[PDB]
């Protein structure tokens, strides 16, 4: 006798487990057990993942309901799960979207200058260099401080809450509340600070005193700051780190992108498609009885949308494990989700990776792992798959 198949399958972000394709072919919708002991429906084909993400009756908001089957414990107050919904209801969607665009004056130049400075520092110190701790993560942090309009010196401390804030835990985390309350207080102080007049916090600070937003709570304004910093920094830092691994393991692609940097945007779209950065399926709670393939999902049940299931589906992306720069459907992947909850920072996430990669190939064209790939230490019980250190030589 064996127990029900458990999720996640592996914390390794450098290879996709053989189990994914086997599930996708035989049972693209099947029952699994999460770390909390709850049962869930794991969805692994492109067709079914898109069906679930395009149907609002599979609710993100309802995953926070008391007594619901859970993928993991909340690291934020339950109302924060409905973050975008709260921003939309406050009439703040357009303002937040405009503040997080990579097209702001001098922002891409700031990204290039920051990427170049970080790399020059690594070259001066000499090999081995750690590309996560000393390149990808400081670059993500520096970008988000600039986008938020907060001092660059405040970035490292806000960053330090992240190894706990984005844990995928079976039980509540006391440290997550300590850090959350402290970071909310920091953001409340930013709103009241007269020096903060640019970026997202500068804009929220002015909307806060505008009569058309007088009834929006100060709780929501601080929340926007903490959530966009956290989600953006963890997502861009983790994606860039694992995209660099995908690139290092493909010297032919690395040489082509160095020779023809105009192909970098098409390269990043493929790096996004094959990315294993999300450690768990995206969770949704059924608010009705809905047919998904061969299964009638019952109201109150948890559904997990496996992004790599969709992104490595041979029926949508032929030869899925291969990076191909001339696919007819390049942006049709689910790396940024789909539907109601499509990533609001997708444009900024793309630009961060494109600039980071462009600067790396120019400064370190001979970049290679300084350790056998099996020596990378993969972070466990976390919302992202990331190596603790990324040792390289050049
Ligand atoms: C490579 C970069 C990124 C990747 C791969 C990524 C991926 C995702 C994915 C897949 C979702 C959907 C989650 C779901 O439907 O359950 C999501 C949502 C979100 N992302 Fe991104 N993201 C990235 C960068 C960013 C950036 C730069 C920001 C902000 C500055 C950001 C802010 C958010 C927020 C706030 C949501 C929640 C949307 C909602 O609840 O409706 N992301 N992201
Ligand atoms: C996903 C949902 N929306 C949010 O904005 C925050 C912040 C967030 C955004 C994207 C993530 O991958 C994680 C958290 N919390 C939530 O529970």
Swiss-Prot record:
Site positions for Participates in a stacking interactions with the tyrosyl of cYY, renumbered to this chain? 166, 180
Q: Which Gene3D superfamilies match?
A: Cytochrome P450
The residues that the entry says bind substrate are 75, 83-84, 235, 299, 383
List, alphabetically, the Pfam families matched: p450
This protein's superkingdom?
Bacteria
* Signal peptide annotation: none
Q: Name one GO molecular function term.
A: oxidoreductase activity, acting on paired donors, with incorporation or reduction of molecular oxygen
Q: Which residues bind heme?
A: 284, 341, 343
Please state where this protein is localized.
Cytoplasm
User: Entry's PANTHER family?
Assistant: CYTOCHROME P450 YJIB-RELATED (PTHR46696:SF1), P450, PUTATIVE (EUROFUNG)-RELATED (PTHR46696)
Q: Which family does it belong to?
A: Belongs to the cytochrome P450 family.
Job of this protein: Catalyzes C-C bond formation between the carbons ortho to the phenolic hydroxyl of cyclo(L-tyr-L-tyr) (cYY) producing mycocyclosin. Can also use cyclo(L-Tyr-L-Phe) (cYF), cyclo(L-Tyr-L-Trp) (cYW) and cyclo(L-Tyr-L-3,4-dihydroxyphenylalanine) (cY-DOPA) as substrate.
Tell me the protein's name: Mycocyclosin synthase
Give the species this sequence originates from.
Answer: Mycobacterium tuberculosis (strain CDC 1551 / Oshkosh)
């Amino acid at each position: 006798a064996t127990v029900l198949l458990e999720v996640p399958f592996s914390a390794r972000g450098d290879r996709i487990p053989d189990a994914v394709a086997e599930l996708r072919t035989r049972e693209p919708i099947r029952k699994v057990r999460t770390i909390t002991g709850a049962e869930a429906w794991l969805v692994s084909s492109y067709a079914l993942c898109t069906q679930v993400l395009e149907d609002r009756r599979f609710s993100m908001k309802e995953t926070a309901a008391a007594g619901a089957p859970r993928l993991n414990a909340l690291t934020v107050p339950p109302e924060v799960v409905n973050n975008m919904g709260n921003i939309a209801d406050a009439g703040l969607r357009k303002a937040v979207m405009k503040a997080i665009t990579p097209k702001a004056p001098g922002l891409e130049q700031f990204l290039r200058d920051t990427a170049n400075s970080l790399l020059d520092n690594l070259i001066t110190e000499g090999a081995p260099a750690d590309l996560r701790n000393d390149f990808a993560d400081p670059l993500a942090t520096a970008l988000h401080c600039k986008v938020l309009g907060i001092p660059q010196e405040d970035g490292p401390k806000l960053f330090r809450s992240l190894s706990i804030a984005f844990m995928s835990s079976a039980d509540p985390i006391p440290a997550a509340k300590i850090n959350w309350d402290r970071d909310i207080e920091y953001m409340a102080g930013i709103l009241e600070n007269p020096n903060i007049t640019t970026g997202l916090m500068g804009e929220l600070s002015r909307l806060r005193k505008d009569p058309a937003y007088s009834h929006v709570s100060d709780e929501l304004f601080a929340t926007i700051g903490v959530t966009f910093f956290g989600a953006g920094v963890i997502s861009t830092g983790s994606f860039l780190t694992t995209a660099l691994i995908s690139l290092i393991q493909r010297p032919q692609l690395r040489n082509l992108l160095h020779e023809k940097p105009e192909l970098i945007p098409a390269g990043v779209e493929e790096l996004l498609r094959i990315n294993l950065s999300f450690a768990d399926g995206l969770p949704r709670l059924a608010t009705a009885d809905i047919q998904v393939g061969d299964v009638l999902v019952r109201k109150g049940e948890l559904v997990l949308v496996l992004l790599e299931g969709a992104n490595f589906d041979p029926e949508h992306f032929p030869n899925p494990g291969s990076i191909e720069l001339d696919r007819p459907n390049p942006t049709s992947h689910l790396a940024f989700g789909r539907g109601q909850h499509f990533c609001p920072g997708s444009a900024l996430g793309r630009r961060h990776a494109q600039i980071g990669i462009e600067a790396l190939l120019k400064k370190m064209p001979g970049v290679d792992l300084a350790v056998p790939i099996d020596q990378l230490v993969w972070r466990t019980r976390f919302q992202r798959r990331i190596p603790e250190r990324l040792p390289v030589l050049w």
